[PDB]
Structure formats: structure tokens, C-alpha cells
Amino acid sequence: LCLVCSDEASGCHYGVLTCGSCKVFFKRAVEGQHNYLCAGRNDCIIDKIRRKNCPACRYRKCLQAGMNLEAR
Ligand SMILES: [Zn+2]
Ligand SMILES: [Zn+2]
């Protein structure tokens, strides 16, 4: 299971057991430019449904999980 947006995970990538999308998301969200906002809220729960409400919390969530694009 995806330990970010709490969905059926395809396989682990980077540092943690994530879905298919959280992989690609994270690699953009780290080594790229981002425009996700929960920089001064950080309220919403990111799961299988509510992740469409906010892709900002997902970055925070995956990081708490232990994601690292230079993990092992
Ligand atoms: Zn996910
Ligand atoms: Zn949010």
C-alpha cells in the first residue's frame, strides 16, 4: 500500500512503499519546480480520495514516511 495517498501500491521506489503516481510526483516535486499550497495551512488528509483536493500535503506526507530520491 501507498503510504502517502493510502492507495494500492504498485511497488516501492526511492525510500518508501508508494503507489505508481507518488514515484513520478516526488521526482518532479524534489528536483523540479512546484506550485502546491499547504505552506501555511497543512490541514487536509491525503488518501485515496482526498488527494484530488490537494497535491501539497502529499509531498509532506511522503517525506514523513521516509521518501528520498537518494535513499537505498
Ligand atoms: Zn500515492
Ligand atoms: Zn493540503
From Swiss-Prot:
Positions of NR C4-type zinc fingers: 2-22, 38-62
Effect listed in the UniProt record for changing D43R: Disrupts dimerization and decreases transcription transactivation
DNA-binding positions: 2-67
Parts forming coiled coils: none
Modified-residue entries (N6-acetyllysine), positions: K61
PTM: Acetylation by CLOCK reduces its binding to glucocorticoid response elements and its transcriptional activity.
Domain-related comment: Composed of three domains: a modulating N-terminal domain, a DNA-binding domain and a C-terminal ligand-binding domain. The ligand-binding domain is required for correct chromosome segregation during mitosis although ligand binding is not required.
Protein task: Receptor for glucocorticoids (GC). Has a dual mode of action: as a transcription factor that binds to glucocorticoid response elements (GRE), both for nuclear and mitochondrial DNA, and as a modulator of other transcription factors. Affects inflammatory responses, cellular proliferation and differentiation in target tissues. Involved in chromatin remodeling. Plays a role in rapid mRNA degradation by binding to the 5' UTR of target mRNAs and interacting with PNRC2 in a ligand-dependent manner which recruits the RNA helicase UPF1 and the mRNA-decapping enzyme DCP1A, leading to RNA decay.
Family: Belongs to the nuclear hormone receptor family. NR3 subfamily.
Subunit and interaction comment: Interacts with GRIP1. Heteromultimeric cytoplasmic complex with HSP90AA1, HSPA1A/HSPA1B, and FKBP5 or another immunophilin such as PPID, STIP1, or the immunophilin homolog PPP5C. Upon ligand binding FKBP5 dissociates from the complex and FKBP4 takes its place, thereby linking the complex to dynein and mediating transport to the nucleus, where the complex dissociates. Probably forms a complex composed of chaperones HSP90 and HSP70, co-chaperones CDC37, PPP5C, TSC1 and client protein TSC2, CDK4, AKT, RAF1 and NR3C1; this complex does not contain co-chaperones STIP1/HOP and PTGES3/p23.
Name listed for the protein in its UniProt record: Glucocorticoid receptor
Residues of the full protein shown: 439 to 510 of 795
